[PDB]
Write an enzyme that holds these catalytic residues in place. Structure first.
Site, PDB file in Angstrom:
ATOM      1  N   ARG C 114      71.060  32.572  70.668  1.00 32.05           N
ATOM      2  CA  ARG C 114      71.782  32.771  71.931  1.00 32.05           C
ATOM      3  C   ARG C 114      72.869  32.164  72.486  1.00 32.05           C
ATOM      4  O   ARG C 114      73.781  32.299  73.509  1.00 32.05           O
ATOM      5  CB  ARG C 114      70.721  32.745  73.204  1.00 32.05           C
ATOM      6  CG  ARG C 114      70.036  33.968  73.133  1.00 32.05           C
ATOM      7  CD  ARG C 114      68.857  33.931  74.286  1.00 32.05           C
ATOM      8  NE  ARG C 114      67.516  33.313  73.842  1.00 32.05           N
ATOM      9  CZ  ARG C 114      66.550  32.584  74.368  1.00 32.05           C
ATOM     10  NH1 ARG C 114      66.475  32.802  75.880  1.00 32.05           N
ATOM     11  NH2 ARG C 114      65.505  32.439  73.882  1.00 32.05           N
ATOM     12  N   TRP C 283      74.589  36.977  63.049  1.00 29.42           N
ATOM     13  CA  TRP C 283      74.550  36.579  61.320  1.00 29.42           C
ATOM     14  C   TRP C 283      73.135  36.184  60.918  1.00 29.42           C
ATOM     15  O   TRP C 283      72.539  35.873  61.757  1.00 29.42           O
ATOM     16  CB  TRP C 283      75.645  35.721  61.182  1.00 29.42           C
ATOM     17  CG  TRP C 283      75.603  34.769  62.033  1.00 29.42           C
ATOM     18  CD1 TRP C 283      74.989  33.374  61.991  1.00 29.42           C
ATOM     19  CD2 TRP C 283      76.774  34.470  62.975  1.00 29.42           C
ATOM     20  NE1 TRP C 283      75.194  32.527  62.878  1.00 29.42           N
ATOM     21  CE2 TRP C 283      76.605  33.066  63.610  1.00 29.42           C
ATOM     22  CE3 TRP C 283      77.875  35.122  63.458  1.00 29.42           C
ATOM     23  CZ2 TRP C 283      77.338  32.399  64.342  1.00 29.42           C
ATOM     24  CZ3 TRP C 283      78.523  34.591  64.323  1.00 29.42           C
ATOM     25  CH2 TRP C 283      78.248  33.424  64.915  1.00 29.42           C
ATOM     26  N   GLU C 288      65.519  33.120  56.924  1.00 26.17           N
ATOM     27  CA  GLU C 288      64.798  34.557  57.216  1.00 26.17           C
ATOM     28  C   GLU C 288      64.874  35.172  55.878  1.00 26.17           C
ATOM     29  O   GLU C 288      63.891  35.879  55.602  1.00 26.17           O
ATOM     30  CB  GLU C 288      65.917  35.167  58.196  1.00 26.17           C
ATOM     31  CG  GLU C 288      66.375  34.748  59.287  1.00 26.17           C
ATOM     32  CD  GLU C 288      67.112  35.828  60.260  1.00 26.17           C
ATOM     33  OE1 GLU C 288      66.558  37.120  60.486  1.00 26.17           O
ATOM     34  OE2 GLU C 288      68.051  35.535  60.636  1.00 26.17           O
TER      35      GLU C 288
HETATM   36  C1  HEM Z   1      75.386  34.895  66.208  1.00 25.28           C
HETATM   37  C2  HEM Z   1      74.471  35.849  65.978  1.00 25.28           C
HETATM   38  C3  HEM Z   1      72.781  35.861  65.841  1.00 25.28           C
HETATM   39  C4  HEM Z   1      72.200  35.210  65.339  1.00 25.28           C
HETATM   40  C5  HEM Z   1      72.404  33.812  64.473  1.00 25.28           C
HETATM   41  C6  HEM Z   1      70.520  35.353  65.814  1.00 25.28           C
HETATM   42  C7  HEM Z   1      69.593  34.658  65.326  1.00 25.28           C
HETATM   43  C8  HEM Z   1      68.123  35.351  65.343  1.00 25.28           C
HETATM   44  C9  HEM Z   1      67.238  35.050  64.693  1.00 25.28           C
HETATM   45  C10 HEM Z   1      67.000  34.054  63.706  1.00 25.28           C
HETATM   46  C11 HEM Z   1      66.014  35.876  65.043  1.00 25.28           C
HETATM   47  C12 HEM Z   1      64.662  35.942  64.662  1.00 25.28           C
HETATM   48  C13 HEM Z   1      64.713  36.980  63.564  1.00 25.28           C
HETATM   49  C14 HEM Z   1      63.177  37.396  62.922  1.00 25.28           C
HETATM   50  O1  HEM Z   1      62.366  36.495  62.917  1.00 25.28           O
HETATM   51  O2  HEM Z   1      62.943  38.640  62.455  1.00 25.28           O
HETATM   52  C15 HEM Z   1      66.491  36.837  66.065  1.00 25.28           C
HETATM   53  C16 HEM Z   1      65.853  37.502  66.866  1.00 25.28           C
HETATM   54  C17 HEM Z   1      66.324  38.449  67.904  1.00 25.28           C
HETATM   55  N1  HEM Z   1      67.806  38.589  68.407  1.00 25.28           N
HETATM   56 FE1  HEM Z   1      69.148  37.315  67.681  1.00 25.28          FE
HETATM   57  N2  HEM Z   1      70.718  36.290  66.734  1.00 25.28           N
HETATM   58  C18 HEM Z   1      72.156  36.754  66.950  1.00 25.28           C
HETATM   59  C19 HEM Z   1      72.565  37.628  67.560  1.00 25.28           C
HETATM   60  C20 HEM Z   1      71.779  38.697  68.415  1.00 25.28           C
HETATM   61  C21 HEM Z   1      72.170  39.731  69.291  1.00 25.28           C
HETATM   62  C22 HEM Z   1      73.917  39.960  69.329  1.00 25.28           C
HETATM   63  C23 HEM Z   1      71.412  40.147  69.894  1.00 25.28           C
HETATM   64  C24 HEM Z   1      71.539  41.335  70.901  1.00 25.28           C
HETATM   65  C25 HEM Z   1      72.467  41.156  71.714  1.00 25.28           C
HETATM   66  C26 HEM Z   1      69.965  39.193  69.593  1.00 25.28           C
HETATM   67  C27 HEM Z   1      68.797  39.681  69.985  1.00 25.28           C
HETATM   68  C28 HEM Z   1      67.754  39.376  69.267  1.00 25.28           C
HETATM   69  C29 HEM Z   1      66.694  39.943  69.444  1.00 25.28           C
HETATM   70  C30 HEM Z   1      66.206  40.890  70.648  1.00 25.28           C
HETATM   71  C31 HEM Z   1      65.485  39.354  68.678  1.00 25.28           C
HETATM   72  C32 HEM Z   1      64.144  39.633  68.477  1.00 25.28           C
HETATM   73  C33 HEM Z   1      64.263  40.932  67.411  1.00 25.28           C
HETATM   74  C34 HEM Z   1      62.976  41.296  66.690  1.00 25.28           C
HETATM   75  O3  HEM Z   1      61.962  41.163  66.952  1.00 25.28           O
HETATM   76  O4  HEM Z   1      63.175  42.300  65.842  1.00 25.28           O
HETATM   77  N3  HEM Z   1      70.316  38.542  68.642  1.00 25.28           N
HETATM   78  N4  HEM Z   1      67.873  36.390  66.278  1.00 25.28           N
HETATM   79  C1  LIG Z   2      70.104  40.397  65.517  1.00 23.12           C
HETATM   80  C2  LIG Z   2      69.450  39.638  64.175  1.00 23.12           C
HETATM   81  C3  LIG Z   2      69.789  38.561  63.834  1.00 23.12           C
HETATM   82  C4  LIG Z   2      69.321  37.879  62.831  1.00 23.12           C
HETATM   83  N1  LIG Z   2      69.834  36.619  62.467  1.00 23.12           N
HETATM   84  N2  LIG Z   2      68.337  38.317  62.214  1.00 23.12           N
HETATM   85  C5  LIG Z   2      67.727  39.549  62.661  1.00 23.12           C
HETATM   86  C6  LIG Z   2      66.179  39.945  62.032  1.00 23.12           C
HETATM   87  C7  LIG Z   2      66.182  41.117  62.128  1.00 23.12           C
HETATM   88  C8  LIG Z   2      64.825  41.741  61.608  1.00 23.12           C
HETATM   89  C9  LIG Z   2      64.816  41.832  60.044  1.00 23.12           C
HETATM   90  N3  LIG Z   2      63.692  42.211  59.636  1.00 23.12           N
HETATM   91  C10 LIG Z   2      62.382  42.142  60.280  1.00 23.12           C
HETATM   92  C11 LIG Z   2      62.430  42.002  61.730  1.00 23.12           C
HETATM   93  C12 LIG Z   2      61.254  41.878  62.583  1.00 23.12           C
HETATM   94  C13 LIG Z   2      60.192  40.809  61.893  1.00 23.12           C
HETATM   95  N4  LIG Z   2      60.718  39.713  61.353  1.00 23.12           N
HETATM   96  C14 LIG Z   2      60.785  43.079  62.792  1.00 23.12           C
HETATM   97  C15 LIG Z   2      59.372  43.378  63.529  1.00 23.12           C
HETATM   98  C16 LIG Z   2      58.496  43.667  62.996  1.00 23.12           C
HETATM   99  C17 LIG Z   2      57.254  43.891  63.601  1.00 23.12           C
HETATM  100  C18 LIG Z   2      55.906  44.210  62.715  1.00 23.12           C
HETATM  101  C19 LIG Z   2      57.158  43.408  65.034  1.00 23.12           C
HETATM  102  C20 LIG Z   2      58.312  42.802  65.552  1.00 23.12           C
HETATM  103  N5  LIG Z   2      58.041  42.428  66.914  1.00 23.12           N
HETATM  104  N6  LIG Z   2      59.218  42.720  64.798  1.00 23.12           N
HETATM  105  C21 LIG Z   2      63.561  41.737  62.222  1.00 23.12           C
HETATM  106  C22 LIG Z   2      68.506  40.192  63.547  1.00 23.12           C
END
Ligand code: HEM
Ligand SMILES: Cc1cc(N)nc(CCc2cncc([C@H](CN)Cc3cc(C)cc(N)n3)c2)c1
Ligand code: HEM
Ligand code: HEM
Ligand code: HEM
Ligand SMILES: Cc1cc(N)nc(CCc2cncc([C@H](CN)Cc3cc(C)cc(N)n3)c2)c1
Ligand SMILES: Cc1cc(N)nc(CCc2cncc([C@H](CN)Cc3cc(C)cc(N)n3)c2)c1
Ligand SMILES: Cc1cc(N)nc(CCc2cncc([C@H](CN)Cc3cc(C)cc(N)n3)c2)c1
Ligand SMILES: C[C@H](O)[C@H](O)[C@H]1CNc2nc(N)[nH]c(=O)c2N1
Ligand SMILES: C[C@H](O)[C@H](O)[C@H]1CNc2nc(N)[nH]c(=O)c2N1
Ligand SMILES: C[C@H](O)[C@H](O)[C@H]1CNc2nc(N)[nH]c(=O)c2N1
Ligand SMILES: C[C@H](O)[C@H](O)[C@H]1CNc2nc(N)[nH]c(=O)c2N1
Lengths: 413, 413, 413, 413
Positions: C114, C283, C288
């Site tokens: 964020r 990114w 991850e």
């Molecule tokens: C600079 C770029 C960004 C970085 C480094 C970043 C980092 C991350 C990381 C490390 C996670 C957890 C991933 C996981 O455990 O699966 C995450 C989840 C999330 N981020 Fe980001 N993020 C970025 C950009 C964004 C953007 C652009 C949005 C939307 C505007 C966003 C919204 C979310 C949301 C909603 C989650 C929860 C997603 C899920 O449950 O699958 N992020 N972010």
């Molecule tokens: C925007 C963004 C940035 C970043 N650095 N990493 C990501 C990871 C996205 C992602 C990739 N693979 C799996 C997931 C989540 C769990 N780690 C998906 C998920 C699965 C389930 C079963 C529940 C849940 N709430 N969310 C998320 C997204």
């Protein structure tokens, strides 16, 4: 005519000429060749035979001096001639004796310590008389040299041989040495190298005390008489407990050693005269105690045990466990001696200094006798520079010869 | 005359008689005495003096057999005496050779690896005539000895010696050695003992590769004529890259060494005859690479680097930091050769197996010639039984002698 | 009524008043709590209950401006009422949209990224109508965000949901993902977690390639219609091949990953409007891929193998072998990304950067919604500052909600 | 009603019904939240607010036995009802207590050790009467649980709260803990989390020793009285000196840690009775010493240093130096405790068993209360099964609650 020799490490070469001035005595790696022994006699050296040598020694001594000393030289030659012709033998001046003891050291080809030669305390104990008195001189000596742990080198000279039957001799090999005992289960406790000598001491009266480090008595021989025993009063034997700067368990090996290494059973030769009583000392080199005294199989043999508590793989011999263990032991010795303000020098530092010694010798008198076998350290040898030094080994005069272990020849009058 | 020899290690004492049949050639630690050299000749050895020796050896050969075959013995001596008759020199059965090579190995006193003397591979090449054939005979020898990891030993005998004008000899020190170069800013890159020779190689047209581990080409000599370079094919050179059981960082040094130690330039003497090219190889000993090759100041000299890298007290000399590196470097060498299944021998196992050999030789021929200075390994000396063994040094026939290196005499065609 | 919030690591201590705005919907660690989902609907959000939420958002938008324009605030507020009264729904101004996507990001309690929130490319694709067209905007988004390895954050926003029966959505959880396939012998090959979806694609016509990293096609829904498949050209799929910087053998596991993480399956809620078509990317964070993608038992599951390969003690649990491998893999990932000039963020920097953000949020708006369970990295947790940070979790507006996956509810034509 | 919860690694789900039985008390990642705390009071718990809770517990207890004990049960229910009608409170049988303490352990939702619950020494100290008597008891407890290195879990129970003016409590948060001092130049020596407390004892007259690992005195409160200080006999405080089995240098950090983790400052609730003095201990999990005690910035904070000691790139974060060290430190902790022969379990083993514990609890009471934030280790979290298990958090009874720390609320006599 000159002989080329090369230091393969530096490329530096010396041209040795001092060899073509040697008493011409491959009995290869023999510890005590006949060539370096001076046995007993039993009539005095023929006076005819002693003369040329005495002129030669007088000549050496006088040409040692800064300016020529013509007057007093000629005086001394005549003086000496007459003395021999009329009395069968001759006596040397207080100075002459200093000069000889220093020179004979300089001429000792197994001593890596030689850079110190000009620096040697000389105890003239020639007018000595009972063993009573020999013992006192030897203490005067140990007190000076132990010097509160700041070891100094010194020599004590007991009257010449005559006869070959009125010898003053120390029978012990070193002034301070640990006893060794054959135990009833056939095992050896103490210092196995010394089982034989200690037996002799027991035979001659000493109470055997059955311990790893009991200091053996002096066995002193005045005017050819039977030898008498004296114990060095304990507070004159300075010792060092072994510990290791990293490993506690080291202390539990309960190891110690004496500070002062003194050869006793060797004989000094000077312009034909022989002194079979002359004990001299220097200070220790790391490895003598570390590698030898502690790891030689026929000495204390602590190598196996240490490997075991370093937890090394003491069974794959190829793991170099033995080499690791050696090194730790050797650090421990140096460390203990340092932690204690007791002079000691590591083998690297020694070799370095020896190289400088060797250098000035060639530069100043055209040579330097040296036993390579003896001079290269019992451990990590090719890491020291002497290892790569081509060296020539020869007998000059004055000189320290070994003699025959006194008990081997003595007649029990 | 039986000569006494003690092993202060155990007490075990040998009697020595073999010294007596040594045509008896202190030149103390001189690396190569004239004593041990076989100079160039321009006439063939005179009919008169070549016959006695020819006989001498045929004798030896026969009184070494199953029992004693009486008139192959008079019919082989008949043969030889009448052979010197008509061209003044003689041949050895494809088989008197197998004997004399194995025998002259048994007789080379500096070889600590002589438990293996009977297990040698003989490559007959006395007919061979261009240098370019020499090349192939050598590559047979190499592929064979390298054995895809598991090293075996081998000698390759080139034609003997006629005028001496027509010699067959390899100019190299060993077959595989690394080149050394003197850099623009005066610094040295590669193996610095070999600069000298690499220089020579370049002048004969070799393109230098200015790299720390470049294999220098063969310089080969076809009966007298000038020499011709042939590079070994890169995959007939087996090499081991170094790494440490415990130190991941050891790789960062990027060190490697070759599998195969072979000696190009020594001369074999057999009952009068001289063969100036006879390469022979064995397998490496831990230290040769670990201690010597890598640590020697005039070799790769990595010691300083390794100690920085183990963060030891590399400024306080008495910290034994040197002795530790050297151990660790040698574990590296020993470990790397196991990891890549290549015959290698740590210096203990060597020493022990030597002591067993030495015992055999005294049991069965009454003597074992040994150069103490070479046999005691270049590290942790006194921890190996050989250090405490008194040894005698003498030349027998047959024997491997050193020659004055070709480029220094050879008349430039 | 502000809530105290302590950072046990620093001792610093925030006062949260922003939770007072939470739409107030222990469901401890549930991945998809019911309360973070927006289900489908099948009639438009009733004019009635939408109106206030629209105004709501409108004030929050204008009350965001540095300036403060009262007459435009009123103009807008007026336009909206008069738009909702007559159409049943309202339209966002282009700008309102940017603001809102940005705000919901700030309002995403699980996103450590964020700090970056004010800085996000918005692609307006609301006028979009065919599925093919969706696929075009998506490749615009991908080429843009990939930016030759210098990744940039961006969101693409498809038509708001009107009546719930005309949804534009991406069915794929993420824009780029690898197929997982169920093999005939029981085993799973590919991304096990994705077998499920892969199957669906196969079902809708996709030809399975049976490979470990096969990129699944896009599954696109245009207003309600059954979905369509498009394959993202391999050119837009930037990938990184894993190598380790100390272990050559790493490359032998032939591992890769994709550079672009894009969530595609979520729903943006702004002022009572729902856009259930809005993929957004950022990114990657080291862990991850390193910890999760490669070590989760239900993912690629390489951990045991990297163990054997590193040589560790992989049957003794206590040896920490599992924890060493995870560190090394995690280095391989960062290393590999650096090596190929592709943005990646490690979890330490990320943690710190969050802390700087969190703190600004507390300063500027009096609160910062935060899911501790998602924010603390999946390895070395307590070593990051977020671990010792007490946090509040709560739902604001705009906000990115989860949806019931399409295939589970879609009625097929 | 049933509540479904998934383990994402295993696929397996439970349905949870035990939560209905939770006394109904997002307060998100808050260490010590209102809802889990147990106030001081100044009246007895009003009798008929106590009654329903007493019947409740008595019911649970008898319901625990394998075979209904109908007569004995009913007897006890009336027993109690009468005791409360007439004294306004009740005692519980020695056995009921044994049962309660165990149940409450089972019900503490942050303890990963719970696999052990059925298995607790219960020191009945309800008769207890002075601060000195308290001290007596606490030693019995420490000598018992310390049990010579072979740790065993135990609880000591001091007399229930009456009017809560006569509370019996140990003010110390744990039994054994190290002092932390604020030094004259504001640096902190010792355990920085413990500064403020250690200051408290300083003020109650403890002589501050100003070292790193000073064991704090016990601050004991009997019958609501002021507290009195007792020092644990040093030979009851078993500690482990820390050494890494690869890195000698670790020993140079001169770290140790106590062997017994005992919580004092918590309150037991049973059937509406409150025990504000019940210290319990179990044994350590690797990580809480290695990761937390040694690496938290607010704790012993060594990480930077170990990094330096290890050659690691302590200045570039992304090198993951921090992650690599936290590993080796942790190995050292386990290895130390293993070699010194003292019970410790590593975080993988811990988690693998909790997982079996959990799975039994569900099998057999339809629930398992679990704080995910506390259960997942502070290192390599995702690598342990618990990370992937959705868990529910709730308060049953019996239960161990936290209290306002005594010095906050003590009326100073
Ligand atoms: C600079 C770029 C960004 C970085 C480094 C970043 C980092 C991350 C990381 C490390 C996670 C957890 C991933 C996981 O455990 O699966 C995450 C989840 C999330 N981020 Fe980001 N993020 C970025 C950009 C964004 C953007 C652009 C949005 C939307 C505007 C966003 C919204 C979310 C949301 C909603 C989650 C929860 C997603 C899920 O449950 O699958 N992020 N972010
Ligand atoms: C925007 C963004 C940035 C970043 N650095 N990493 C990501 C990871 C996205 C992602 C990739 N693979 C799996 C997931 C989540 C769990 N780690 C998906 C998920 C699965 C389930 C079963 C529940 C849940 N709430 N969310 C998320 C997204
Ligand atoms: C500065 C002090 C000295 C040092 C550091 C030193 C060093 C050594 C060492 C290490 C040895 C070999 C010991 C062994 O192999 O057991 C040795 C041998 C010898 N040194 Fe010295 N030395 C010193 C002084 C002297 C002195 C003062 C003399 C007599 C004047 C002397 C004469 C000898 C002799 C004759 C040997 C032959 C060893 C034998 O067989 O016993 N050294 N020296
Ligand atoms: C069985 C395997 C062999 C081993 C392990 C072995 C071992 C050694 C070692 C360790 C050295 C000293 C190396 C040095 O100082 O540079 C050496 C030298 C020597 N070995 Fe061997 N050897 C082997 C085979 C042979 C063979 C086959 C011959 C001849 C037939 C031979 C004759 C010699 C000679 C003459 C030297 C002196 C080398 C020189 O001065 O350059 N060895 N040997
Ligand atoms: C086999 C023995 C045991 C092990 C291995 C163990 C393990 C643990 C661990 C690692 C924690 C987290 C500690 C922290 O983060 O500071 C914990 C917390 C806790 N355990 Fe245990 N436990 C054991 C026995 C017990 C016993 C006997 C009780 C009481 C009957 C207990 C009650 C608790 C409680 C109440 C907590 C909450 C900690 C707090 O905030 O103070 N555990 N346990
Ligand atoms: C003056 C001096 C200095 C110094 N640093 N070390 C010493 C050591 C004297 C010494 C002590 N213990 C044993 C020995 C030698 C054995 N290494 C004596 C010896 C023994 C034998 C059997 C033969 C021989 N030639 N020499 C010598 C003397
Ligand atoms: C047959 C065999 C076996 C084995 N294990 N190692 C070898 C080593 C051969 C070798 C390799 N590199 C250098 C050398 C000798 C130094 N030790 C060369 C040399 C130089 C000088 C000046 C004299 C000399 N005699 N020998 C010899 C040979
Ligand atoms: C019975 C038992 C077993 C075990 N393995 N570990 C323990 C932990 C003992 C302990 C030692 N030092 C600190 C703690 C807790 C930190 N995790 C102290 C604590 C502090 C705060 C502010 C809140 C809280 N709820 N708990 C606990 C107890
Ligand atoms: C000068 C001295 O003889 C020279 O350094 C010798 C010593 N001993 C050796 N011993 C072996 N085995 N190999 C060598 O090269 C040498 N070098
Ligand atoms: C056999 C051999 O001469 C004997 O073991 C020698 C070798 N070199 C030595 N060198 C020194 N300095 N001291 C010794 O005791 C020995 N021992
Ligand atoms: C059960 C638990 O909620 C689940 O495994 C979560 C835990 N925390 C997480 N945190 C992040 N950032 N990403 C995740 O996928 C998960 N998985
Ligand atoms: C803020 C957060 O709750 C706090 O730092 C917690 C997190 N999880 C924990 N988990 C355990 N087991 N022990 C702790 O001290 C903490 N600390």
């Amino acid at each position: 005519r000159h002989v080329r020799i090369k230091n393969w490490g530096s490329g530096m070469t010396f041209q040795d000429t001092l060899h073509h001035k040697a008493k011409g005595i491959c009995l290869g790696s023999i510890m005590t060749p006949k060539s370096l022994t001076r046995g007993p006699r039993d009539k005095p050296t023929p006076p005819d035979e002693l003369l040329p040598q005495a002129i030669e020694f007088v000549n050496q001594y006088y040409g040692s001096f800064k300016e020529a000393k013509i007057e007093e030289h000629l005086a001394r030659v005549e003086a000496v001639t007459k003395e021999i012709e009329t009395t069968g033998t001759y006596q040397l001046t207080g100075d002459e004796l200093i000069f000889a003891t220093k020179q004979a050291w300089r001429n000792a080809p197994r001593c890596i310590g030689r850079i110190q030669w000009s620096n040697l305390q000389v105890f003239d104990a020639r007018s000595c008389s009972t063993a009573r008195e020999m013992f006192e001189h030897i203490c005067r000596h140990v007190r000076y040299s132990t010097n509160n742990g700041n070891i100094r080198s010194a020599i004590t000279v007991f009257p010449q041989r005559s006869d070959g039957k009125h010898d003053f001799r120390v029978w012990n090999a070193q002034l301070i040495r640990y006893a060794g005992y054959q135990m009833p289960d056939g095992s050896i406790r103490g210092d196995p190298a010394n089982v034989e000598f200690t037996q002799l001491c027991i035979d001659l009266g000493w109470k055997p005390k059955y311990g790893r480090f009991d200091v053996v008595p002096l066995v002193l021989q005045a005017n050819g008489r039977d030898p008498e025993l004296f114990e060095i009063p304990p507070d004159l034997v300075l010792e060092v407990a072994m510990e290791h700067p990293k490993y506690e368990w080291f202390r539990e090996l309960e190891l110690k050693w004496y500070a002062l290494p003194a050869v006793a059973n060797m004989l000094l030769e000077v312009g034909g005269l022989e002194f079979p009583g002359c004990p001299f000392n220097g200070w220790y080199m790391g490895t003598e105690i570390g590698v030898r005294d502690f790891c030689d199989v026929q000495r204390y043999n602590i190598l196996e045990e240490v490997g075991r508590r370093m937890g090394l793989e003491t069974h794959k011999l190829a793991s170099l466990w033995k080499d690791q263990a050696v090194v730790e032991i050797n650090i421990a010795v140096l460390h203990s001696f340092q932690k204690q303000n007791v002079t000691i020098m590591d083998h690297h530092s020694a070799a370095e200094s020896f190289m400088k010694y060797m250098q000035n010798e060639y530069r100043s008198r055209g040579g330097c006798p040296a036993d390579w076998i003896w001079l290269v350290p019992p451990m990590s040898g090719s890491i020291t520079p002497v290892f790569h030094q081509e060296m020539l080994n020869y007998v000059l005069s004055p000189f320290y010869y070994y003699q025959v272990e006194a008990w081997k020849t003595h007649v029990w009058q």
